[model samples]
Target: GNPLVYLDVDANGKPLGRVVLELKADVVPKTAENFRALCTGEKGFGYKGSTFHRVIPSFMCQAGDFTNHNGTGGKSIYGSRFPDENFTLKHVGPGVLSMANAGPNTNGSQFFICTIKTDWLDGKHVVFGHVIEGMDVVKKIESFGSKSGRTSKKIVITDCGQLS
Candidate 1:
C-alpha cells in the first residue's frame, strides 16, 4: 500500500489547517524516501518546524529548510545531497508535492505543494506526493502571497510526518 504524510500548517500566525498527503513511494521510491526521511527528522534534521520560504501563487508553496530556515539551505538524509528522481508520475493539478531543487539531479531537502496545475513543470520535478485532505488550507496559504517568489506572512509547518 502507498504511505501517507501530513503537513500541518500555521499561516499568518494562526493555525490554518492540516494537509494530509498520500505519498506514492511505490511510484517514485527514491524521492519519496528522501521526503519521508526529512519529514520524520531523520539524522537529527527534519521539517518539523520549517517555514514556507517561498509562496508563488498559481504555482506552489516551497519549504523543508530546517537547517538554515531560508530557501537556499538544507541537506539530504546523507547530510549532503541526492540525485533527482524525475519520474513520470505527472503533476496533474493543485496539491501536487514535488521535490524542489537547484538544477538537474540536485534534490536536497526542499519541496513544494502546487496550488495550481503546474503543467510546465511536468517533466522537471519529481512528484512524490499529493494533498488529499486540505485544499482549503492550501488556498489559504496561496492567498498569503505578495508576488512571484515571495510570501505575505509567516507560513510554517507545525508538524510533518507519515500517518499510521
Candidate 2:
C-alpha cells in the first residue's frame, strides 16, 4: 500500500523548476505513507539537496537519487517497499507522473514526469497523478538521448501540501 502522489507538471509535462507534489491518504495508502515519510521533514533530508540528474527528450524527466544525484544511488532510508499497486493509469500523455523503480517491488522514492505518450511503459510503472498546469516548461528542458551520454536538467519540487 503505497501513497497516492499528486505532481504538478511544467508546460511540457516535465517536472522542473519549483515543482509541487501532493499526497493523499485515500488514493494509495501504504505508498502514500512511505512517500510522505520520505519527503516529510524527518527523513527527506537526503532528497532535499538532490537534483534532476537525467532528462530524456520527449520522454521523461527524473530525479530523487540522494547519493550522487544519479538515478541509481538513492532509496528511502526508511526501508519500505510497497507491493506494486499497478493502477489503471496510463502514460499516454504529457504531465503524467509515474513511479521509478529498479524492478518489481523495488520502488523507492525516485519518479519521472512524462512529456509524451509512452505506450510501451504501460503496465510497468505506476501512474498516480498528472500535471494540472504548465506543460510548456517541460518541453523547454535540455534533453539528450538514452542512458548513454545522458544530458542533465535542473528541476526543483518547491513544495508539497494538501490540494486546495
Candidate 3:
C-alpha cells in the first residue's frame, strides 16, 4: 500500500498554498518512494529553495534541480539513478505528476505536473501521482512566465511535511 499527501508550498516560495497529490504506488513504486523520502524531511531539506525552473502552459511545469541556483544546471543527488519505471499511466489532464528526465534511465529528482492531457508523453515518463487539489495554484504559477518563455518568478518547494 502507499500513502498520498498534500504537496503544500508557495509556487515561488511566497506565502503558503497547498497542492494535494494522490500518489499511486502500484504505478510507479520507485518514483513514489523517492517522493516520499523527499516529503518526509529526508530529502525535503535538500529541495529547499529549488525552483520550478521550466513551465509549458497547457502542457506541464517542471522543477527539482539541486545544483543550479536557477534551472540551467544541476544533477541528481540520490547517489545513483534508477531505471525507468515506465507504466500504462497517461499524462493526460491537469495535475498529473511524472518524472522528468533527459533520456532513458536518467531520471533523477526532477518531476513535473501536467496542465492538460499529454498523450504524447505517456509511456515515456513515470507517472507517480495526480493533483487532487490546488489546480488554481498551478494556474497561478503558470501565469508568471514572461513573453520570452522565462518565468519572471521562481517557485520554491520550501518545506514538505507529513499530514497528521
Candidate 4:
C-alpha cells in the first residue's frame, strides 16, 4: 500500500480535523520516504509539535520545521539537508504537496500544501504527495492565513502519524 499520513491541526487552541495525505512514493521514492518517516516519527526527530510557520490564502500552507518551529531550521533524515529526488509530480492544483526549499537540491524537513494551482512551482520544488482527505480541515487552516503568508494565530500540528 501507499504511505498515508495524518496531521491533526489546532488554530490558536481550537481543534481542527485530521488532514490525511498520500505520498506518491512510486514516483519520488526518496522524497516520499522522507515525508513518510517524518510523519511516522520512525526517526528520533520528526514533525510533531511543529507549527505552520507560513500560510498564505490562495497560495499554500508551509510547515515541518520542527527544529526552529519557524521556517528557519529543520534537518532531513539524510542530514541537515538532502539533494532533491525529482520533480515528476506537477503543482497542478490544490492539495498538491511539494518540498519547500531555498534552491535546487536543498530539500529538508519543510514542505507546503497548495491551496490553488501553482504552475510556476512546477520544476522548482519536488512534489511527493497530495491531500487525499481533510481538505476541509486544510481549508480551515487556510482561513487563519493572511495575504502576507502569516497566520493570525498559531496553527500547530497537535498530532501527526502514519495512518495504517
Candidate 5:
C-alpha cells in the first residue's frame, strides 16, 4: 500500500477523528502525484489553513483552495494547471476522493469528498483516492456544509503527508 493522504480536521475537538485516503496511483499516476504534492507541501502551498469552500450535503464537500478561501485562487503543485488522466474510476460510492476542476482537463489542487453515490460524475472528475476511516467525520462535515460555502467551525487540514 502506498503512503496516502492523512487529513486531520477540526471536528469540534473530536477524538481521534482522522481521515485517511489511499491514493490509486497505479491508475491515476499523474493525478495522484499532483495531489500528493499538495499533501506534502512540496510546493509550499499544501492544504494548510484551507477551508471546505463549497459544501453540498449528500453531494460533496469541496475544498483544497489553499491559496484563497474561495475556489478562485489555487493552482496545482506544478504552479499551473495540468491535463486530466483518462481513468474509469466512477464516483458510485460514498467517501470517494476526487479532483475538482473547472472544466475538462483542468484539474488543480481543489478536491472533494463524496458522501453519497454520484455515478453521473463518471468522466467529469478523477477518482484518485478513497477514505479508509472516519466516515462519521466526513458525514458530519457533509451535514454541516452549506451552499453558501461557510462553516461555523472551520475545517482545516492540520497535517497531510504520505503513509509510508
Candidate 6:
C-alpha cells in the first residue's frame, strides 16, 4: 500500500478540513519520500504552517514554500534542490499532486494539487501522489484563488503529518 499523509487546512485561521494524500512510493520512491519526510518534519522543516500561496480555479492549488510563504522559496532535505526523480507518473485528473519547479530538475518542497484534469502537465511535472480524501477542502482552497493565481485570503496548512 502507498503511504498516506495529511494536511489540515485553515482559511484565515478558521479550520477548513484535512486533505489526505496517498504517496506513490511504489512508483516514485524519492519523490514520495521527500513529501513524506516533509510532512513529518523529520528535517526540522515541513508543510505544517505553509500557506497555499498560489491557486487557480479549475486548475491547481500550489503550496509548500515554507521559507518565503510564496511561490519563490523552498528547499529539499538533500540540499537547496533535488533532481527530478522520474516522470513515471502523469497528471491525469483532479487531486493529482505534483512537484512545482522552476524549469528542470529544480524541485524543492513546493508542490501543487490539480483541481481538474491537466493532461498537458504530463512529463513536465513529477506526479508523486493524489488526494485520497478531502477533495471538498481542496475545492474550498481552490475557491480562494483568482485568475492571477493569487489567493484572496490565506489558506494555510495548520498541521500535517504521515498517517500511521
How well does each candidate superpose onto the true structure, as a TM-score? Answer: 0.93, 0.70, 0.85, 0.97, 0.90, 0.98
The alpha-carbon lDDT assigned to residue 67 of candidate 6 equals 96
Worst 10 residues of 4 by lDDT: 79-88
Candidate 3: pairs in clash? 11-155, 12-155, 92-117, 93-117
- Please provide, for model 5 over 1-164, each residue's C-alpha lDDT reduced to its tens digit, 9 standing for 90 to 100: 45477777764554325778888888888888887878888777788657677778768888888877788767887656888887578897899999888889888888999988988888888898889887887887777677666665666666777665
Better by lDDT, candidate 6 or 1:
6
Task: Summing lDDT over every window of 10 consecutive residues in candidate 1, give the lowest-scoring window.
Answer: 78-87
Better of 1 and 3 by lDDT: 1
The full ranking of all candidates by TM-score, starting with the best, is 6, 4, 1, 5, 3, 2
Put the candidates in lDDT order, highest first. Answer: 6, 4, 1, 5, 3, 2
How does model 5 fare in lDDT?
0.79
Error of 6 at 62 (Å): 0.2
* Top candidate by lDDT: 6
Off by over 4 Å in 3: 11-13, 43-45, 72-78, 146-149
- On TM-score, the stronger of 1 and 4 is 4
lDDT of 2 at 161: 35
**Relative to the unseen true structure, what is the C-alpha lDDT of residue 145 in candidate 4, on a scale of 0 to 100?**
89
* RMSD to true structure for each model, in Å: 1.4, 4.9, 2.5, 0.8, 2.0, 0.8
lDDT of 1 by residue, 66-160 (tens): 77888888888865678767567887998899888787888888888998888788778888989889989888888887567778788999888
Per-candidate count of clashing residue pairs (backbone under 3 Å) = 0, 16, 4, 0, 2, 0
Better of 2 and 6 by lDDT: 6
Off by over 4 Å in 2: 1-16, 22-25, 44-46, 77-80, 142-149, 152-164
